[PDB]
Amino acid sequence: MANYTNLTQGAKEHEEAENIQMGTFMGVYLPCLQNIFGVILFLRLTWVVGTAGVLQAFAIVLICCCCTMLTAISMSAIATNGVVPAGGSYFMISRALGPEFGGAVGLCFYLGTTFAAAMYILGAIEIFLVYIVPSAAMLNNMRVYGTAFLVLMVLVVFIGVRYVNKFASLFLACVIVSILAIYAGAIKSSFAPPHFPVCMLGNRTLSSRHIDVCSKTKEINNMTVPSKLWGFFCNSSQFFNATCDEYFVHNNVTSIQGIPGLASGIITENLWSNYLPKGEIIEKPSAKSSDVLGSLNHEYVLVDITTSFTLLVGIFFPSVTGIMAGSNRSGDLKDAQKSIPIGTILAILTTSFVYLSNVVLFGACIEGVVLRDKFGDAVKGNLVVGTLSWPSPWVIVIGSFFSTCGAGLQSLTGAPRLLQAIAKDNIIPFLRVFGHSKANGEPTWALLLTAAIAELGILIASLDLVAPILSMFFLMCYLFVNLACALQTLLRTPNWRPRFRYYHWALSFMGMSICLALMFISSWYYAIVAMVIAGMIYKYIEYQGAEKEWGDGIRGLSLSAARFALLRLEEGPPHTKNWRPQLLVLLKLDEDLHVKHPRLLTFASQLKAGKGLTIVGSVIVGNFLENYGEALAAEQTIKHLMEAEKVKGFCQLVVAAKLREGISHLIQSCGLGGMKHNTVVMGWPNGWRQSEDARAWKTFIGTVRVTTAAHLALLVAKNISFFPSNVEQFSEGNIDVWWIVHDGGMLMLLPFLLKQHKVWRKCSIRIFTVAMKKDLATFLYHLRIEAEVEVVEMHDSDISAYTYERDLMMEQRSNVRRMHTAVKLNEVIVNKSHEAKLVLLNMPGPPRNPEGDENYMEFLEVLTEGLERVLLVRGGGSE
Amino acid sequence: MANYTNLTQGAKEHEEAENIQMGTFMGVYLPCLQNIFGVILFLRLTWVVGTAGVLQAFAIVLICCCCTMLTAISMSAIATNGVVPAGGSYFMISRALGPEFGGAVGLCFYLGTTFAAAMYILGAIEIFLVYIVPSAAMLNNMRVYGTAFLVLMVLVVFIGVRYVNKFASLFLACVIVSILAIYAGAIKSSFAPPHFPVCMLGNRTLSSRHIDVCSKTKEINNMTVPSKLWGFFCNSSQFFNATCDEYFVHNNVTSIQGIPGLASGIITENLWSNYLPKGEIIEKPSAKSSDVLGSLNHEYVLVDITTSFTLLVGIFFPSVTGIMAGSNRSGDLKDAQKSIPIGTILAILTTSFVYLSNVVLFGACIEGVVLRDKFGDAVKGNLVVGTLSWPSPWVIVIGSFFSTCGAGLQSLTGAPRLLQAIAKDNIIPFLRVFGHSKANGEPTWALLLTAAIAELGILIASLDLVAPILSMFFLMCYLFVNLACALQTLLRTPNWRPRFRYYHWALSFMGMSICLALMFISSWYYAIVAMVIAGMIYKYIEYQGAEKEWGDGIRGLSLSAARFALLRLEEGPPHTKNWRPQLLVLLKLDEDLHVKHPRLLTFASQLKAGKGLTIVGSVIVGNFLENYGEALAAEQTIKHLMEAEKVKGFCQLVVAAKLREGISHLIQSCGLGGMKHNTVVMGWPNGWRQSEDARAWKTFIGTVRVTTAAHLALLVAKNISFFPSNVEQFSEGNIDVWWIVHDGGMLMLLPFLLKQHKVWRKCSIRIFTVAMKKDLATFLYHLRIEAEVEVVEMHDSDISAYTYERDLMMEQRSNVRRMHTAVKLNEVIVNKSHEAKLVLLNMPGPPRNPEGDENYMEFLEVLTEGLERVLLVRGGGSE
Ligand SMILES: *[C@@H]1O[C@H](CO)[C@@H](O[C@@H]2O[C@H](CO)[C@@H](O[C@@H]3O[C@H](CO)[C@@H](O)[C@H](O)[C@@H]3O)[C@H](O)[C@H]2NC(C)=O)[C@H](O)[C@H]1NC(C)=O
Ligand SMILES: *[C@@H]1O[C@H](CO)[C@@H](O[C@@H]2O[C@H](CO)[C@@H](O[C@@H]3O[C@H](CO)[C@@H](O)[C@H](O)[C@@H]3O)[C@H](O)[C@H]2NC(C)=O)[C@H](O)[C@H]1NC(C)=O
Ligand SMILES: *[C@@H]1O[C@H](CO)[C@@H](O)[C@H](O)[C@H]1NC(C)=O
Ligand SMILES: *[C@@H]1O[C@H](CO)[C@@H](O)[C@H](O)[C@H]1NC(C)=O
């Protein structure tokens, strides 16, 4: 009907989509099903079940499948987010997680896939040599034939990948036919089990490669000649004065049915772990037994490796890997974000069900002794899982070989394409050599490097030792795929819109934890090494991207960190639950281009206590075309002054023609979007009456109006020459805060920040509210600093200039009276707080008409007449 | 002569210095020495030597001393940088590494100190019970006696810490007297070793708590009666047909000298590991032996714990811990930055030399069987190391007890002070409860919590099991102390001036790696838990600091990240090794407040390709007091447009009185210090001749002058309405870069940034140099980008207006002819490149006199007459 492929899509298809079909079943389901079902299912699942007991084997398969299922959910969350690139899964992961995580996952998954092509070559060799056509001799035969087979497969992939594309379907056919034959044998074996017997001497297990009859004697022509096994246990071979060993004269050889019915119920026997160390004779705890020992013969089938749980999880994990292959055909899809998630999750559920079913079936169908036989012995040298099959074990012996060769081809085509895809992205420099492609878009040097690493793997010619390394690399890939999603969801990374029905970051975090535990339990030895390798590749990719875009290595790294923080800061709720003053100190520069008020900087330092944001801005009057040198010089001056007063922050000079216009630009333009200020700190215009130009107060009131309009808070410090330095202290004093009807946020917050500095540490706080005891106490209760309160009420007209404003606020959603009431306020404040070290004091808004600006300044001067040090405060905003 | 103490200085002594003597020996040396010499030296060092073999014991002691020495170097680097606060080591660590690392190290060191108070109480109890005043019965005796002793010590430190301060000198005296007695015994054991014999049955060692003579029969009144050991190996006790077991009738009991001479040469025997598992009889591979077996008796000295290498390193590590106690008496110092590093490093060298010498002395003076005896058995119940002393083992057994109870007092004074110091800092909120102090400043709740944790430790009543947890916590403390230093030195963290003669960041990195390996080798399953607890405390402290200073949790967290990156960015070389265009796109806003040139944003996105910094700036002509609504509206519009054109960056609007002045402020004030732009991208003023207002081109040339004076690059795009979009592409085309005489760097770097985008991907590049050939080829080969070259030389007059300015540059570091030559340049440029897709072109500077601005604009206009899409480029800077 239709011809399809299971391979990956490298740069060949991505460059095609960059220059400018199949559904869910044939597109993202069958490739994943063909790539999860590996050699393990046929060569090591039985041994794992036997060695672990059905309970712990079920636990193993469940833990592995849960790691891989949470990784599938994270990978589907990656697939749905944004447009899915036409390339393989690597391109999806890159465009979804940034080039850093993309390169880390790419290299770890690549080493995984290479060592998988090695494991599959070892498995095909083991099947060909042990079962198809018959210690260290076996290992060296495997080394030699595996190297020959790898050279052949490398040539196959290099010359004729089109034929791999054509016969991927035949490979999947073989896989599914083998699995269905396993199930048909398992079901048939219930009523009619096959006649595969096993010789067993007492409770010690015998081999069957050389023995023919499970009897201590055979009778040819009614002659009690002793069986061949007598020769394999007694150095007499004739029974004539047979000097037989200890355990042989006592016990009984029995031909136990090796495949009992699924209804026979052997599961009660093998429901428990064995974990016997290396070289122990395999015992069935059912048959009779003597107690003498010693006769360690050559025919006793032995445990071939010191097995443990932590070892079994590693040996079995490479049978569930392959879910990144689910999306290796993502370019040829109709609805990517719909086909990929459902396809991957359904394929993983299918394979998990197949494994969890075969575990229990093997528990109930194969004898508890033939399971622990890791090389298909004791059954006349037949595949143990093969004994469960309807036609013959040869269908499995052939299907497994063809499937393992097909998976080797798939992973020897998927590894170099992935490596050249990582190379052409210029993510990592040194891999550029591997970008070299063939004419039709096929890798040349990547294939050679893949072959070299696969050979390095094959040098360890044992599946039982190649599986842990493969599992560790794939576990690192899955751990990063889960962690990147969890991180980008928590921190609210920009362009992280996971349009998935079931993805929650708790799933990805639980997956990261599960698979990290798997890594470390399997082998912390390899786990630390893999984590460090992946971390180094990650940091190196980040450094290279920095040096590529910003131009410097470490400079650009910090630059990128700052840019990313500010960007993340933009796509958020611009309001904050608490109000904190981020100061903009408007320093006044004299004609000497020297700060006319260092006390402004000292007080800003005292207010922020060296933490937070402090932008010190200043305007130089003149033309920028002919002042840039003076601008840089004054900037160095202000930076030295800031560093001298321990102010941590930045400086900005604007050369403008009009000081008023310069300030009106500074107030509204300082800071990058997100890092805006919300308070403007000014110095009082001393000697405003003594200036015949009157431009002092005009500029001051213009700045006040601009700050009020911009909705920023305002702190005008008056008599700033008396504000203390850093080195001196106050022995004792009182900050008297006069919190009028309005702006309780600032008037209550500032003295708390100020008393928190060492200079103002030894002073007390006195709130002389003029605008109730419990409500004010709550704020003090939260600030956790005792602050004596007191109320001094006066007439409304006395507070007219305030309450008028209040009315204007309410509706929003005479001069002689204002002056003589400012003098009444003066009388109270001076009589109560003359000796205060710092008097905070609320401000009225400037008049709506610009004519009363002189009157406004006279009002302020009166309101502050006689006080040693005043901090005029105005809220202005929301808070 | 003088009285001192070795305890810590908490917040009580720091608030004194905030409100407002000893040298090196008595100030930093003796406290560190008295705190490193713990109980291990006396109770488990001999056992470790025995069960490890002198070689591996030396390796273990060397690794521990190596980690502690590298951590001492990092801590000295912390101590020298800046002023040393008057508080304990915690205040130094905090002020040097920030509150996050300060709190993490504080809590890890505090858990360390609590479990150290527990280990020292267990050790004092073990010495009292086993050696001074005599399986699970012993464990329960230790539990109950340790709980009683802990409640006593807690009461002592709560009531009467002054007497502990007084007797710290007596405790140190005890330590030194004990160590000198050990050395004097080792020396006297050269000629005349002591008479401590051990009964040994062949090569199997016997106990001696109940035996009297190491003979099978003693003779009272000429009667060869059987010895008591007969009563312990033979259930006859009469010799009248005695039925003795297997091993006893064959072998011989011998009185082997237990302490041979130092020159005896027994070291050759115990120079190898034993690592025997649990319950194994201790075997001396020197004496004769039969081969019979079976006699498992009660008098065989048995290995009391399953020793291993990874267990031994953990059991021994808590004898090198305590280096932070060196600077726990820093407030009472004369020259802190000189006294702390020298004192700490000399103390660690002294203790390391003592340990490395005692390892070899124990190897070569004590029989290889008495060393592996972990409870001083087989020597009539005396301390193993005690047997090596000049007067008697009693001096050592009393000195060790007094030293260990003194160190218990020390750690129950040092742990709660450190906890109240971490509480009063309000670094971690929930610990605020423990901030309460006594009248004289002594912790009350902190002492109770320390008592609770120490009791939890004591409930595991075994030094051998408490030591790994203690060692893991101190290892985590040292790991953070080495990693924060490595990071702050590499990343150029502000205020990180390590004024030390020998501190190089490679040392701290090596220490970090060393004792990361130590953690994991000791117990990876404990170590991951410790790392995760420390990481959670670290991130929670960072979050609380963000919420405190900025006002919000996650928003403020990204804010802190951005501010810290910018600060770190300031104190660096302001130049960059590479130049990369960081664009300021100047969008001109029409009277309708709509973006007059979206193609500006499109081309900016194509130039930066979604990465880098793009500040889109625009000026709104008008008065700010009555326009802020329009400002927010236009800002939202420009932000939506930036998102529409795939531009990632920030938007700044300035409401200015004069458009020219607004742009002159924007060009010099955009961006925070460090994140400054370097290029200004402008749109050409189309229809300047048809708009009879002379201010259009005036404003344009003013912006050009401002850019040139600011030393920023300039990119004027002309005919921008026909520039492409993001969706469309080019089939085939040539980006022709016409590098006129100067400013080649940008003119060549731009077309590669352009062609690296999907739009311009399918175009070619042509460098039409006018004013060698191989010089370009080498630059392009270094950049790994190839293009097509062509050279078109012309007459000098034609480029006169250029060359003039070039000469004015070389000297630094008419108009009608200019127009007739711009027309000649036009001839050639069109004849070669008329049908190009994008013609880059260098620019001449604006005239010096602002009168010829009409002439300059006519020059430009004719130079670009007839070209489809021109990108005028001007260097301006260094590059
Ligand atoms: C296969 O047969 C051998 C030999 O009969 C079994 O070894 C023996 O197993 C029995 C288990 O009942 C052991 O008995 C136990 O002995 C210990 C020590 O004496 C005693 O404390 C227990 O209460 C129990 O009686 C016996 O020692 C052991 N023989 C040895 C170790 O030499 C073997 O267990 C059989 N395999 C299976 C799977 O049952
Ligand atoms: C302390 O004395 C006991 C009692 O003899 C020693 O145990 C025995 O040590 C001999 C050492 O030669 C062991 O012989 C060995 O047998 C193995 C197995 O055939 C062989 O491969 C070796 O070459 C060697 O001949 C013997 O098995 C062992 N008997 C036991 C353990 O029951 C013990 O070794 C002595 N300890 C030391 C430290 O010397
Ligand atoms: C072996 O078989 C014989 C006869 O079938 C039986 O008497 C004997 O008990 C068996 N041996 C054991 C150990 O059960
Ligand atoms: C025990 O000592 C006697 C005499 O001293 C000697 O004959 C005998 O061989 C010794 N036994 C062993 C096992 O060496």
Author numbering:
A (entry chain A), B (entry chain B): 102 to 121, 133 to 246, 260 to 896, 905 to 946, 1028 to 1093
What did the study's authors say about this model?
Potassium‐coupled chloride transporters (KCCs) play crucial roles in regulating cell volume and intracellular chloride concentration. They are characteristically inhibited under isotonic conditions via phospho‐regulatory sites located within the cytoplasmic termini. Decreased inhibitory phosphorylation in response to hypotonic cell swelling stimulates transport activity, and dysfunction of this regulatory process has been associated with various human diseases. Here, we present cryo‐EM structures of human KCC3b and KCC1, revealing structural determinants for phospho‐regulation in both N‐ and C‐termini.
To understand the structural basis of phospho‐regulation in potassium‐coupled chloride transporters, we used single‐particle cryo‐electron microscopy to study the full‐length wild‐type KCC3b transporter and mutants of this transporter in which two canonical threonines (T940 and T997) and a third KCC3‐specific phosphorylation site (S45), which was shown to play a role for full activation in response to swelling (Melo et␣al, 2013), were replaced. We show that phospho‐mimetic KCC3b is arrested in an inward‐facing state in which intracellular ion access is blocked by extensive contacts with the N‐terminus. A unique feature observed in the phospho‐mimetic KCC3b‐PM structure is the presence of pronounced density for a short stretch of the otherwise unstructured N‐terminus, a domain that has not been resolved in any of the previously published CCC structures. Electrostatic surface representations of KCC3b in absence or presence of the N‐terminus illustrate that this segment is wedged between CTD and TMD and partially inserted into the inward‐open vestibule created by the helical arrangement of TM2, TM7 and the helices TM1a and TM6b of the transporter core domain. The direct contact with the ion coordinating helices TM1a and TM6b results in a visible obstruction of the ion access path from the intracellular side, suggesting that this domain arrangement could play a role in controlling transport activity. While this structure was obtained under K+‐free conditions, we see the same configuration of the N‐terminus in a lower resolution structure of KCC3b‐PM in presence of K+. Density for N‐terminal helix (purple cartoon) is visible in the cryo‐EM maps of KCC3b‐PM in detergent environments, in both potassium‐free (A) and potassium‐saturated (D) conditions.
